[PDB]
Amino acid sequence: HHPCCSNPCQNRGECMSTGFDQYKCDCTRTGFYGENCTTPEFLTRIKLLLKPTPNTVHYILTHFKGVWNIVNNIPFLRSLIMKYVLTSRSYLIDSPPTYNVHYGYKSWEAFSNLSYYTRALPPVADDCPTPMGVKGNKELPDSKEVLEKVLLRREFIPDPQGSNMMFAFFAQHFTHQFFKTDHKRGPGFTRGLGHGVDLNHIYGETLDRQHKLRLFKDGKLKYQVIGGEVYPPTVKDTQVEMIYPPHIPENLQFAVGQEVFGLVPGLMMYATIWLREHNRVCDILKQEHPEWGDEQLFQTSRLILIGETIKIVIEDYVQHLSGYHFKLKFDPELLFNQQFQYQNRIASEFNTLYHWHPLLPDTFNIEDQEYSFKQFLYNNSILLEHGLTQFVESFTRQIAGRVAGGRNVPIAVQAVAKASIDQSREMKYQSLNEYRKRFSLKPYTSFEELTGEKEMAAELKALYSDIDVMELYPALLVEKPRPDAIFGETMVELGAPFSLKGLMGNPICSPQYWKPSTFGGEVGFKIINTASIQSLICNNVKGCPFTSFNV
Amino acid sequence: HHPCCSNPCQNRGECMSTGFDQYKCDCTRTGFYGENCTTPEFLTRIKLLLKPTPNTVHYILTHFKGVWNIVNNIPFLRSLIMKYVLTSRSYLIDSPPTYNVHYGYKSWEAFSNLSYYTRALPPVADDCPTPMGVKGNKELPDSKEVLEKVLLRREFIPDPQGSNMMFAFFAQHFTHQFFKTDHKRGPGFTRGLGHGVDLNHIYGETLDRQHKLRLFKDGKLKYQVIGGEVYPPTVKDTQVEMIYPPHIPENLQFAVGQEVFGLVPGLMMYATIWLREHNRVCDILKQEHPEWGDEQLFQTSRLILIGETIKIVIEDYVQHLSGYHFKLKFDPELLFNQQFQYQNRIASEFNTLYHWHPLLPDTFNIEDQEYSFKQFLYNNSILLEHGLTQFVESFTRQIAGRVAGGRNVPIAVQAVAKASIDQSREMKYQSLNEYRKRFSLKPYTSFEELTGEKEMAAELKALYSDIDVMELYPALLVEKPRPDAIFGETMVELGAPFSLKGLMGNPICSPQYWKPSTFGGEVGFKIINTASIQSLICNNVKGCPFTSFNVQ
Ligand code: COH
Ligand code: COH
Ligand SMILES: *[C@@H]1O[C@H](CO)[C@@H](O[C@@H]2O[C@H](CO)[C@@H](O[C@H]3O[C@H](CO)[C@@H](O)[C@H](O)[C@@H]3O)[C@H](O)[C@H]2NC(C)=O)[C@H](O)[C@H]1NC(C)=O
Ligand SMILES: *[C@@H]1O[C@@H](CO)[C@@H](O[C@@H]2O[C@H](CO)[C@@H](O)[C@H](O)[C@H]2NC(C)=O)[C@H](O)[C@H]1NC(C)=O
Ligand SMILES: *[C@@H]1O[C@H](CO)[C@@H](O[C@@H]2O[C@H](CO)[C@@H](O)[C@H](O)[C@H]2NC(C)=O)[C@H](O)[C@H]1NC(C)=O
Ligand SMILES: *[C@@H]1O[C@H](CO)[C@@H](O[C@@H]2O[C@H](CO)[C@@H](O)[C@H](O)[C@H]2NC(C)=O)[C@H](O)[C@H]1NC(C)=O
Ligand SMILES: CC/C=C\C/C=C\C/C=C\C/C=C\C/C=C\C/C=C\CCC(=O)O
Ligand SMILES: CC/C=C\C/C=C\C/C=C\C/C=C\C/C=C\C/C=C\CCC(=O)O
Ligand SMILES: CCCCCCCCO[C@@H]1O[C@H](CO)[C@@H](O)[C@H](O)[C@H]1O
Ligand SMILES: CCCCCCCCO[C@@H]1O[C@H](CO)[C@@H](O)[C@H](O)[C@H]1O
């Protein structure tokens, strides 16, 4: 079998077979040397002794509120800290990207083919004696067993951080512009060739689709007016393909950028909001530039919305997730004097860690009504009957579920959660502990250590036998959360690097893009730099309801 | 008309309409301010006082031969200078890329659609009163007139730098992996979506084409053996689509990565050499890695040949062009402590400046035979009759034409030279002086300053009327050359930044790729770092003939 099956190389060293039973580790720029890159250099040894553990940095950022109030209000100091935050996490991502599901060694195919999700860790070789390499049993525990014993929801566990359904549907809507798995090809493949925040979920992946969604007057997107209220146009009027079951009336078959957004009224809510926002921006730009044509009005509005998205995602969305007292800042200028690659490639593992199905509640509470999953799916008449205003008011009030801590995946989505385990195995994912080492974390030495608890640990112990063969995905959902937090260590220390690369690696953040002329002047630039989840709703939802990402 | 037609914004500021009749310059990070980004900042005043002219910099590098011989033999000094060569030049390129033929403003279409060549300078707006903006006549001079008067060759003008046919065909072969204009779509469109040195001209642009060219054993490419010599496989054997006229029979229809390389035997020579090289690397890798399968063998060989190409382009090809006494170095480690984007987008203007048709000779001299263009075109029989050994020997010793200096485009390719002018015009290119400013160069104040000569300068003024409406492409071919040099100032100062960016911006130069493991260990890595035009020939051509890019 492959000599690298045991993953002998440490500290981001690279394994290469040198014969049927021999390997060699490449320790170049790891800061380590020796057969397995285990011996540290003098500079590295001191650097290791001083580096605070992720849980210590988390403590500081979620305590000393009085000091953070001061830091947050000194621009020079706030910028300095945000600069470290960005740079320290960006470094953990390979850019230009390296491996994918088919290539556990660097290759031009892996680099050039945008149809693949990239991979933070190479896949386990096909001929390895064990699913994870050398350790554990010949088969991983049955995925259904794992799901039922440690993942499925017994009782609904609310998020201690206060996350609401406004946040939950935002996460789903937003992340679904770059998580577009090509099922015709396989789970290691994507339909989102932009590999980041291009807003294809509003505008369409292809030009052909974009043009069916456009009005071609004043730069705007097509729309319909039902009961005085602006909604996306129909499948019939646009000839835009959407996923809908055949029983749904032509009227409620809304056509938007992303084919799957008719699945959930919550997604259609943000689809309508962003559609309204783009047309609102077109009106603003048409007044600033009465001399501009439709094409520039559209293009310029798109870039502004990309700006709004990255701004809202950092300063509202990530801010809320973080639980920090420190105010995260969206400012491209922070990287202008730093070494940073303005490019991104969506990692398969980023996709997997983002399967936050526990967020989903048992019922969807709108006004006085409580809708079940069956009632809620594909039902756009709920959005029409209640209206966006009510939808915002209700989902701001309804708490979402805790992601970590175990046993909170709703039964309605059991098949999806099982799929997340199966496809991980199909894609030959390395173990949780390997992913932890890859992201500078000390590997878990027991199931009790991972879970911070006793019952789920015991079950997992009987299923996997060895902590070093625990899988990434189920571990993220069973992990001990941070104090009163939605996630545990692994979720954050993997998610944040992937997250920040995709946000800052956007072209609009590059020095040659980050200037007022890119966005139609100061007026367009102003829209970005003052954008918030509150302003987004206020500008586009009748009666400007209050909103946030917490209850 | 559009308020930015006059190109009012200077020093890299960006123009934006602010009404039907008014504009605004965005002077962000230009180092200048004011209405037209003309008022320099204090730090910028100091920088413009200390920075030497490109002509001064060229002089130092092409003189003091003894000093550079010391510099080239102290590794630290050589590394320090090469570092500046790369950095001082790379800020001149927008990366991520900005404009294209359809977008004079930054947009997502422009950034995300890889089918476009990018643009170093936005196109002149459609509604502008004159083709160049506001200056000049309603129409530009007839392209035929510009071609006939100052471009077409009379007496053959050899390149004083001594560039040979080995250089000419290498240039043609190497650049045609990234200059692949999509003529069904338009001149502003490319079919090379890799936008750089991916060797698609050897391996194919698509996966289906690659798979028809591969042997699927030992990581090799398909081939045939004619008279003991390894040559590309046929169209009949591979089912790989190639551009061949009807009269060309099945046997002489070689299938290679790039569909037009059958056009010229000179290109097929390099296609055959590189095909042999790939398969030679596979053998080396097989010996190092008996456990490796076909796919990895092929993949890592590709990565090695990409490395070899970049090595040869910098240390032989560009080295020769530059005419420097200073030895250029391919070393990615030099950029690891620098701000640099490992990405590239081929610029339309880079394509245009690379139409070096004056390089082409009147006839192609091989052994005792002098072949005319008609005799040479689409004729791989010539290749088989003489063999690659005689091709290298003959082409190594035949001199190329001088590109700059005017009146040196062969008549045989006159329709091509005309097309470059016509296509620049439909692509709405800005004037020469606008591109010169774009690249930190002083605009020419007269046609005599452009040529350094009286006769052509007179012909040009009678056609263009104003120096500020002179087109970029014809200007490059008529430009006053540097002393005893193949090119003039504009060619180099535009070409060099596009080039280095294309080469160093390759992902194999990034810290995570620039490791022995990427190339199958230290032996694979050594093949990249010791590559040269001579070794390429020596390793793959019977008898190991001597070669270089100059005579002889
Ligand atoms: C952000 C949190 C979140 C939420 C709230 C959510 C809520 C819901 C929901 C109820 C409203 C339904 C019916 C679905 C249904 C699906 N989910 Co999500 N999902 C979420 C995170 C994800 C992500 C991320 C993916 C991967 C997308 C992909 O691969 O296409 C996913 C996968 C899926 C898929 C693709 C199948 C696959 O194999 O990946 C479907 C269908 N699920 N989801
Ligand atoms: C680098 C120097 C060089 C040389 C030596 C050279 C030698 C020759 C040559 C004799 C060997 C002939 C018959 C031609 C003829 C042509 N040249 Co070149 N060309 C050169 C530089 C270029 C470049 C660069 C392009 C742009 C390629 C493209 O696809 O637009 C080009 C374009 C062309 C085209 C149109 C592109 C197409 O797809 O057909 C033709 C025809 N020509 N050239
Ligand atoms: C990116 O990677 C994809 C996966 O390798 C690749 O899709 C694959 O394309 C090949 C060739 O186009 C298909 O293989 C087919 O080749 C023979 C040719 O004779 C056909 O008769 C068969 O249909 C055979 O399947 C693969 O089917 C296909 N793999 C899939 C669907 O997963 C993409 O082409 C690559 N992307 C680019 C732009 O190159
Ligand atoms: C910024 O723009 C330039 C033109 O690009 C210049 O405007 C022109 O000034 C000329 C005299 O110097 C006039 O002949 C001409 O009327 C005018 N062109 C216009 C406005 O259409 C401005 O002077 C210059 N501004 C500054 C501050 O120097
Ligand atoms: C590098 O790693 C290899 C394989 O992980 C080490 O070989 C192992 O050594 C340990 C302790 O002596 C044994 O438990 C294993 O039996 C050995 N190999 C295997 C496959 O089990 C090797 O010692 C390491 N190199 C150094 C010097 O640290
Ligand atoms: C990149 O741009 C080109 C040109 O706009 C796009 O090609 C056009 O596609 C539309 C709709 O599919 C066709 O109707 C036209 O015939 C095409 N125009 C041409 C050939 O000039 C191309 O689709 C774009 N690429 C991507 C990835 O969207
Ligand atoms: C293409 C990718 C672009 C954007 C990424 C999208 C969303 C990112 C949001 C969350 C990422 C996943 C898990 C949590 C990780 C980080 C956010 C929370 C806390 C960490 C704060 C920090 O240090 O950045
Ligand atoms: C993707 C593109 C990558 C590489 C292009 C390869 C070769 C380009 C060669 C010539 C272009 C034309 C003119 C200048 C070219 C090279 C520089 C020559 C002299 C100046 C030396 C220097 O300052 O680097
Ligand atoms: C509501 C859906 C849950 C069905 C669980 C079926 C698998 C049984 O799982 C068991 O669940 C018990 C109750 O939490 C735990 O005490 C046990 O540790 C666990 O093994
Ligand atoms: C030996 C030719 C060098 C001088 C030519 C410059 C004048 C251009 O003359 C042109 O030459 C073309 C090529 O035959 C012809 O097609 C044109 O009809 C002719 O006018």
Ligand SMILES: *[C@@H]1O[C@H](CO)[C@@H](O)[C@H](O)[C@H]1NC(C)=O
């Ligand atoms: C859709 O929503 C309506 C209320 O708007 C609800 O009464 C109905 O039952 C739902 N449809 C389905 C099929 O559940």
